[PDB]
């Protein structure tokens, strides 16, 4: 995961680099709070 | 006027004020089309297999044979022409102008700043010669052809630093208001072996694509510094770049509507092949300003500054021998700075006198 | 007055309809501008009233006859953007990543 | 200084594929104290290990399935398809939601409760069975309310997404729901949802 | 797909006979048309070992 894009509970999207694959700006799943997500941690994400 | 006070008390806003929303109607309008477009591959046409089948290579991807759209200029589908491809049916959608190097783009989009021919100072004969040799082919080629001469390819502008070659070329571009390629030679030499000549090729290909363009290659002594066989790798790569420039300049592919300006401080080290005509037909000695040229420089650069009472160019000219252009402008600059030492809102003769004194001292 | 009041009623009804038309447009624009945009470096902007060419992070160059759903003036050739993952138009602009060594110094 | 070095090139192959997104039929709840979530008709509690309460308190909240109706009785459950029916269940309240979160078709049966007695029969995990219960289904205010007595009040409300299906007359459908197979820890459960309509 | 099977289960709940034809629109180049129609197999039918569909002719 990369820059938080300054969410403040209204822009929770982050751009994430999936390895040698592309990078996408995405949002969170309901099961994770933003406090658990921060720049530079490995995150498991869905595929579509 | 019973219910016709101004207009029913409602239509004044019901007609236009709320009708501002219709402008947003226009806004979302673009959006609808902005959502029915699907985007397109970009590739380069490799070959014309037949009147319909085009061998086209997508960038960083596979290559295909693809047909073109029903209405298109197949004559302009030359090999190497960057094109777009429908992502689904994979057909030639529309041609694109040749991809430009980011370096060439950056060198191509610096604003000349509309500097006027008034703002040069004492270059009348040389500025007239340069105006001739560059601009006249861009005005009346019929004049030259009835005379019978081929319009000049370009010219060299040699002189000591600070003599205004960069500003002179910038002014030429501003008067022309054409595509300007302000290029400094020292910025194109690279450790990557084949990249400098590639950059020169990209520069000249951009120039050919965007006629009328002006190629201003500053500090050309950093490229065309004579060819010799000592054999060190660096100067050898420099010779390779120089000969790439020579080909791009007076090579097999004849040049049309592209004129070049090359400024240097050491004209004597230029390569004889580059020095030869056909490439640099004119050598213009933009030399140190003379006394008349000096006073012209002061009077022209004296414009923006506000003068209180009396300011004489002649004394500054006598006290500033050996000055060349920018340094004279320096005299003005710190003068305004001098104006803040004693907190004025203007300038005085003593201000300018001590300013030119400090400039001369710094020049020592 | 009478014909002018009729014009007033006509214009207010067309506004009343166009409000919900705008609401529907916004609904469908959110329907298509969902969220999982794909990052891409805008290679440059060309003229046709402007078109773009970008380089997505799936190492693919991509020509756009219309530059998505953002403005079209700043759009630096290198401006990282979030472009839709299927129809490939610039749905949003996002702040630049870094310039390598400029990150090296804090 | 006179470096002038060449350059090699090492490509990195890159590719992936989104699979057939998998529907997870999961229910969530926080009825008394635990955010229990169960996947499922075999039942398996995902999180919220061995329940502080009995399973039965939540067994009644379990689309894609509907009771069997005769030809005389209009099958609002059936003709509400393909969209299905959304219900509000009052025990503690239960609602079924259909969401698109992530790459999983979420058929939530989100559970919620309150007013848990400190010695109520629902938390000591005692359980005999659920005797067959008859739900009287009738329309109150355009909503199909089913009144059922719990034997071991229920005020079910069923609304079809297709808000055009005619409402069946007040009938009495007999539900027989019992926990067929399970474990003592109640983590590997098999449920029974047999129910037939009766006029 | 899994979601396709899911929606088809939803449709079959409406009526046991219900088909889920799908069409490949870019593989349908002039000439051949790439299109098929599938219903389902009940899980209990398959796990019990019985074949999904009885056969009485060569048509199928
Ligand atoms: N005719 C001129 N001759 C010399 N210098 C000038 C002239 N006109 C302006 N300048 C000064 O030269 C500065 C720009 O540098 P310049 O002298 O054009 O580059 P170069 O070193 O190529 O001659 C400007 O700030 C300006 O004050
Ligand atoms: Zn499908």
Swiss-Prot record, chain A:
- Disulphide-bridged cysteine pairs: none
What modifications follow translation? Monoubiquitinated by RNF181.
Q: What induces it?
A: Expression is not cell cycle-dependent and occurs throughout the cell cycle.
Source domain of life is: Eukaryota
Q: Where in the cell is it found?
A: Cytoplasm
Q: What does this protein do?
A: Component of the 26S proteasome, a multiprotein complex involved in the ATP-dependent degradation of ubiquitinated proteins. This complex plays a key role in the maintenance of protein homeostasis by removing misfolded or damaged proteins, which could impair cellular functions, and by removing proteins whose functions are no longer required. Therefore, the proteasome participates in numerous cellular processes, including cell cycle progression, apoptosis, or DNA damage repair.
Similarity remark: Belongs to the AAA ATPase family.
Assembly and binders: Component of the 19S proteasome regulatory particle complex. The 26S proteasome consists of a 20S core particle (CP) and two 19S regulatory subunits (RP). The regulatory particle is made of a lid composed of 9 subunits, a base containing 6 ATPases including PSMC2 and few additional components. Interacts with NDC80/HEC; this interaction is detected only during M phase. Interacts and SQSTM1. Interacts with PAAF1. Directly interacts with TRIM5. (Microbial infection) Interacts with HIV-1 Tat.
What name has this protein been given in UniProt?
26S proteasome regulatory subunit 7
Gene that this sequence comes from: PSMC2
In terms of the parent sequence, the fragment covers 98 to 145 of 433
UniProtKB/Swiss-Prot annotation, chain B:
One matching Pfam family, short form? Prot_ATP_ID_OB_C
Cite a single GO MF annotation: protein-macromolecule adaptor activity
Subcellular location field: Cytoplasm; Nucleus
* CDD domains associated with the record: RecA-like_PAN_like
Entry's SMART domains? AAA
Can you tell which superkingdom this protein's organism belongs to?
Eukaryota
Give residues where N6-acetyllysine occurs.
57, 191
- What is the protein's major site of localization? cytoplasm
Disulfide bond annotation, renumbered to this chain: none
GO terms in the biological process aspect are:
ERAD pathway; positive regulation of inclusion body assembly; positive regulation of proteasomal protein catabolic process; positive regulation of RNA polymerase II transcription preinitiation complex assembly; proteasome-mediated ubiquitin-dependent protein catabolic process
A Gene Ontology term for the protein's cellular component: cytosolic proteasome complex
The answer to whether the entry has keyword Glycoprotein is no
Binding residues annotated for ATP, in chain numbering:
159-166
The record's keywords, sorted A to Z, are: Acetylation, ATP-binding, Cytoplasm, Nucleotide-binding, Nucleus, Phosphoprotein, Proteasome
Q: Which residues carry this modification: Phosphoserine?
A: 229
Give the InterPro entries listed for this entry: 26S_Proteasome_ATPase (IPR050221), AAA+_ATPase (IPR003593), AAA_lid_3 (IPR041569), ATPase_AAA_core (IPR003959), ATPase_AAA_CS (IPR003960), NA-bd_OB-fold (IPR012340), P-loop_NTPase (IPR027417), Prot_ATP_ID_OB_2nd (IPR032501)
Task: Give start-end of the signal peptide.
Answer: none
Q: Which family does it belong to?
A: Belongs to the AAA ATPase family.
Assembly and interaction partners: Component of the 19S proteasome regulatory particle complex. The 26S proteasome consists of a 20S core particle (CP) and two 19S regulatory subunits (RP). The regulatory particle is made of a lid composed of 9 subunits, a base containing 6 ATPases including PSMC6 and few additional components. Interacts with PAAF1.
Specify the protein name.
Answer: 26S proteasome regulatory subunit 10B
Say which species the protein is native to.
Homo sapiens (Human)
User: What gene name is given for the protein in this entry?
Assistant: PSMC6
Curated annotation (Swiss-Prot), chain C:
Q: How is it modified after translation?
A: Sumoylated by UBE2I in response to MEKK1-mediated stimuli.
Which subcellular locations apply to this protein? Answer: Cytoplasm; Nucleus
Q: Which disease is it linked to?
A: Deafness, cataract, impaired intellectual development, and polyneuropathy: An autosomal recessive disease characterized by early onset of deafness, cataract, severe developmental delay, and severely impaired intellectual development. Patients later develop polyneuropathy of the lower extremities, associated with depigmentation of the hair in that area.
Q: How does it assemble?
A: Component of the 19S proteasome regulatory particle complex. The 26S proteasome consists of a 20S core particle (CP) and two 19S regulatory subunits (RP). The regulatory particle is made of a lid composed of 9 subunits, a base containing 6 ATPases including PSMC3 and few additional components. Interacts with PAAF1.
What this protein is reported to do is described as: Component of the 26S proteasome, a multiprotein complex involved in the ATP-dependent degradation of ubiquitinated proteins. This complex plays a key role in the maintenance of protein homeostasis by removing misfolded or damaged proteins, which could impair cellular functions, and by removing proteins whose functions are no longer required. Therefore, the proteasome participates in numerous cellular processes, including cell cycle progression, apoptosis, or DNA damage repair.
User: Span of the full-length protein shown?
Assistant: 52 to 176 of 439
From Swiss-Prot, chain E:
Residues modified as Phosphoserine: 28
Q: What does this protein do?
A: Component of the 26S proteasome, a multiprotein complex involved in the ATP-dependent degradation of ubiquitinated proteins. This complex plays a key role in the maintenance of protein homeostasis by removing misfolded or damaged proteins, which could impair cellular functions, and by removing proteins whose functions are no longer required. Therefore, the proteasome participates in numerous cellular processes, including cell cycle progression, apoptosis, or DNA damage repair.
Name which cysteines form disulfide bonds.
none
Q: Which domain of life is it from?
A: Eukaryota
UniProt note on tissues of expression: Widely expressed. Highest levels in heart and skeletal muscle.
Q: Where does Zn(2+) bind?
A: 4
- Family (UniProt): Belongs to the peptidase M67A family. PSMD14 subfamily.
Assembly behavior: Component of the 19S proteasome regulatory particle complex. The 26S proteasome consists of a 20S core particle (CP) and two 19S regulatory subunits (RP). The regulatory particle is made of a lid composed of 9 subunits including PSMD4, a base containing 6 ATPases and few additional components. Within the complex, PSMD4 interacts with subunit PSMD7 through their respective MPN domain. Interacts with TXNL1.
Identify this protein by name: 26S proteasome non-ATPase regulatory subunit 14
Where does the sequence pass through the membrane? none
């Amino acid at each position: 995961c990369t820059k938080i894009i300054n969410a403040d509970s209204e822009d929770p999207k982050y751009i994430i680099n999936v390895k040698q694959f592309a990078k996408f700006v995405v949002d969170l799943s309901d099961q994770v709070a933003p406090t658990d997500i921060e720049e530079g941690m490995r995150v498991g994400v869905d595929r579509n | 006027l019973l219910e016709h006070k101004e207009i029913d008390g409602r239509l004044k806003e019901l007609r236009e004020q709320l009708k501002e929303l219709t402008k947003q109607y226009e806004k979302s309008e673009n959006d609808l089309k902005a959502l029915q477009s699907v985007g397109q591959i970009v590739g380069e046409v490799l070959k014309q297999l037949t009147e319909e089948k085009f061998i086209v290579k997508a960038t960083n991807g596979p290559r295909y044979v693809v047909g073109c759209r029903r209405q298109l200029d197949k004559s302009k589908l030359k090999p190497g022409t960057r094109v777009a491809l429908d992502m689904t049916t994979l057909t030639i959608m529309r041609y694109l102008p040749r991809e430009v190097d980011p370096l060439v783009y950056n060198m191509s989009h610096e604003d000349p700043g509309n500097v006027s021919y008034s703002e040069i100072g004492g270059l009348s004969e040389q500025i007239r010669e340069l105006r001739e040799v560059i601009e006249l082919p861009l005005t009346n080629p019929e004049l030259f052809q009835r005379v019978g001469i081929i319009p000049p390819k370009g010219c060299l502008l040699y002189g000591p630093p600070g003599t205004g070659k960069t500003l002179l070329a910038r002014a030429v571009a501003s008067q022309l208001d054409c595509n300007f390629l302000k290029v400094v030679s020292s910025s194109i030499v690279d450790k990557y072996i084949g990249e400098s000549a590639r950059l020169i090729r990209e520069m000249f290909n951009y120039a050919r694509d965007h006629q009328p363009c002006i190629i201003f290659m500053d500090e050309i002594d950093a490229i065309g510094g004579r060819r010799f066989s000592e054999g060190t790798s660096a100067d050898r790569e420099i010779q390779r770049t120089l000969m790439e420039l020579l080909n791009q300049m007076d090579g097999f592919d004849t040049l049309h509507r592209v004129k070049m300006i090359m400024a240097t401080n050491r004209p004597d080290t230029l390569d004889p092949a580059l020095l030869r005509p056909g490439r640099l037909d004119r050598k213009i000695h933009i030399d140190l300003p003379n006394e008349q040229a000096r006073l012209d420089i002061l009077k022209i650069h004296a414009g923006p500054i506000t003068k209180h009472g009396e300011i004489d160019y002649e004394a500054i000219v006598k006290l500033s021998d050996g000055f060349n252009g920018a340094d004279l402008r320096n005299v003005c600059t710190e003068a305004g700075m001098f104006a803040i030492r004693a907190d004025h809102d203007f300038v005085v003769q003593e201000d300018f006198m001590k300013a030119v004194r400090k400039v001369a001292d710094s020049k020592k | 007055i009478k014909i002018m009041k009729s014009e007033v009623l006509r214009v207010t009804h067309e506004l009343q309809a166009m409000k919900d038309k705008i609401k529907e447009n916004s609904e469908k624009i959110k329907v298509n501008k969902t969220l999982p945009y794909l990052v891409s470096n805008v290679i440059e902007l060309l003229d046709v009233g402007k078109c773009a060419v970008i380089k997505t992070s799936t190492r693919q160059t991509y020509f756009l006859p219309v530059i998505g759903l953002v403005d079209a003036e700043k759009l630096k050739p290198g401006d990282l953007v979030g472009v839709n993952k299927d129809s490939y138009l610039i749905l949003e602009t996002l702040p630049t990543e870094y310039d390598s060594r400029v990150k090296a110094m804090e | 200084g006179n470096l002038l070095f060449l350059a090699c090139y090492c490509i990195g192959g890159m590719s992936a594929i989104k699979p057939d997104m998998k529907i997870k039929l999961r229910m969530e709840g926080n009825v008394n104290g635990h955010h229990f979530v169960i996947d499922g008709m075999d039942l398996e509690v995902k999180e919220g290990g061995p329940l502080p309460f009995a399973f039965d308190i939540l067994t009644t909240a379990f689309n894609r399935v509907f009771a069997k109706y005769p030809d005389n009785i209009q099958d609002y459950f059936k003709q509400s398809f393909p969209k299905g029916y959304s219900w509000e269940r009052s025990l503690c309240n239960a609602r079924n939601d259909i969401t698109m979160e992530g790459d999983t078709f979420y058929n939530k049966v989100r559970f919620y409760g309150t007013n848990f007695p400190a010695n109520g029969p629902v938390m000591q995990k005692k359980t005999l069975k659920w005797e067959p219960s008859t739900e009287k289904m009738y329309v109150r205010d355009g909503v199909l309310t089913g009144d059922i007595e719990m034997a071991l009040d229920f005020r079910t409300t069923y609304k079809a997404k297709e808000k055009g299906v005619k409402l069946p007359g007040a009938h009495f459908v007999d539900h027989c729901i019992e926990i067929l197979s399970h474990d003592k820890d109640y983590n590997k459960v098999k449920l029974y949802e047999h129910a037939v309509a009766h006029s | 797909s899994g979601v396709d099977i899911n929606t088809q289960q939803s449709f079959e709940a409406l009526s046991e006979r219900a088909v889920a034809v799908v069409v490949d629109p870019i593989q349908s180049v002039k000439g051949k048309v790439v299109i098929d129609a599938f219903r389902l197999i009940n899980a209990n039918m398959m796990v019990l070992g019985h074949e999904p569909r009885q056969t009485t002719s060569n048509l199928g």
